Amino acid sequence: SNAIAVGSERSADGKGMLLANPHFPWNGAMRFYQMHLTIPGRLDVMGASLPGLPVVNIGFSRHLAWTHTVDTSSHFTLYRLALDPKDPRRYLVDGRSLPLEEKSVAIEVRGADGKLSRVEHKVYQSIYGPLVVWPGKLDWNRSEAYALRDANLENTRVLQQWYSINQASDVADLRRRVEALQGIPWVNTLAADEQGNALYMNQSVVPYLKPELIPACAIPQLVAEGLPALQGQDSRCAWSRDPAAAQAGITPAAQLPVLLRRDFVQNSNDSAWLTNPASPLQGFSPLVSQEKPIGPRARYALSRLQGKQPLEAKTLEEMVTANHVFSADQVLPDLLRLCRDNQGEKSLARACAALAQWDRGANLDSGSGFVYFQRFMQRFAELDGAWKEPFDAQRPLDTPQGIALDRPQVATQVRQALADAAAEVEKSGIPDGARWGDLQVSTRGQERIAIPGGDGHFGVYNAIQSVRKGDHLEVVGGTSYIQLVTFPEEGPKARGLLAFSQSSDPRSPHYRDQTELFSRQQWQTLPFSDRQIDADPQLQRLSIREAA
């Protein structure tokens, strides 16, 4: 997901502005749906929601717009159990042997013959939560096992939290409502209001350990691999209690990152750290936010946002619709120099020519250079010490950069990587001259629709993930509900699209209509006022009722 909120010090109109670009599946239980909800006098909100939820999850109201992005905080911890050496179904806490609980579930299974059979299955549980096995990493042997405590299992506040967000008036009110209930499970919140405040909150449900416990309780090797793993044989490693937290054992709201600005805040799924580099967010629990190198989408966004020039709605829209492959900025200039140094290598000629021609984008008409670049990058990623300028913590916006071509080993390996990628691409059965939109599509009945964008890991802000399906790349997730909101005097002006269209049913008139628009990158008005709704010549009305 991406989000950008702009305030009064940087917007062209001196008021707030918000770009919401969540990247979520195109099918299933996380498929967004647009709707506008009104209880006259006290609720009037529009945006998009997830299946089955009677609340707006990303949206806007008269003076406020908000969105979310998946955060980097941990929302569970693993506990390494010390098993009782006499019995692997018992584990030790403070030296005392405790039995696992066994909860059995019964499932009905339809067989080859069409009959049902009953399958029973035992779920083992510790005082922390159920046991989990990852063969070869988190095993259950005679010495140890692993249990998992999920902080959102006791978060009964999640629907209430978006009901409350849906009632918020402005950014101060949104912040009070979220800090008060702490019902957000696993996203950041970014918002702007008409008055020109830009807000970032990393306010979600996060296991709490007091600072002195963190180094004491960690399993060092697993934490080094990114797993929030704790010593489960020591009762002192229970999540910490603080009366200010809304739920036992979660982090109180005052200890979670918040930034309130009048220039901008942004996030593309990195930590809170460089939300706005003019005011770095540091000094939080590592369960909450760490200072890690930011990914290419955020580096892209900050490259467009930093500086003194006013930001227009069009500027934010075009950050999405440009489909710029920002990772190419870091590697393509030195890669092309390597191509020029090897004009005699016949095996490289077609890739070098494609890469040279390429518009450095993931547009429908972008040439095969994009595909060569992706396959090259997948190999470049595996090389060691190949960056000319490695990540520098004092230059987090501009590193890593460049290929270290002056090191003879690197030149050799990078050239091999390109030859490998070139052979891989050419071994695929892709028609000569095919462009990116010929390859990447979304199927609708037995038509396809060409879909622009590309993988967020290559720094394409319009992130689209696809999978090979027969002769094509079928879109499975990415840019989904798009909303760009500004606050002119008459009322909120919201523009965008639901990329995969309102309905998942091929019979519906709304199965592919916005997908055609998304293909052409033609965003539309999101009508909110009674005036905007009535001006629609497609307006249909129905009133329904029944007894309770």
Partner: protein, 163 residues
């Protein structure tokens, strides 16, 4: 009772007006069923842990989990005691939104003749309850936690006598 006024604008975007949460929920559940009844029905089968019952063990959920492991995980996650606790902890406003949604989804199902729904007549397409919406909510709740370890939970069994 329950009542909603619905306006749709271009691209099938509903605008629901009601005097209270139950009526608002009624409008939402009806509008959403009109567009996505089959999707919600499938995901409710998943969150009830009934995929293997309707589709056998060789299929997967839309999260690409195998049907039987997915069912074990959701039967565990959405046990009756957990759903009752979650319900008892909801405010009247949220209970009303959920009651209205279920009723509005079910009203669309009673009236549908196939204009916009491809799965009428399938045994897994049926009237829904507020507990089903709680199942969906809980499934989403744990997506940043134990849901990412669903296969690992189902796989967890103690060792035998191996060396």
């Amino acid at each position: 009772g329950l009542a909603a006024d619905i306006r749709w604008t271009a691209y099938g975007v509903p605008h629901i007006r009601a005097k209270d949460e139950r009526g608002l929920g009624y409008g939402i559940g009806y509008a959403y069923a009109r567009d996505n009844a089959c999707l919600l029905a499938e995901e409710i089968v998943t969150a009830r842990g009934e995929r293997a019952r309707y589709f056998g063990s060789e299929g997967k959920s839309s999260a690409e989990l195998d049907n039987l492991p997915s069912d074990i995980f959701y039967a565990w996650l959405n046990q009756p005691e957990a759903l009752q606790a979650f319900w008892q902890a909801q405010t009247p406003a949220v209970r009303q939104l959920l009651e209205g949604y279920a009723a509005g989804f079910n009203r669309f199902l009673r009236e549908a003749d196939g204009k916009t729904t491809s799965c009428l007549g399938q045994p897994w397409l049926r009237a829904i309850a507020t507990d089903d919406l709680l199942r969906l909510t809980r499934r989403l709740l744990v997506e940043g936690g134990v849901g990412q370890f669903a296969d690992a939970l189902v796989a967890a069994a103690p060792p035998g006598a191996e060396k």
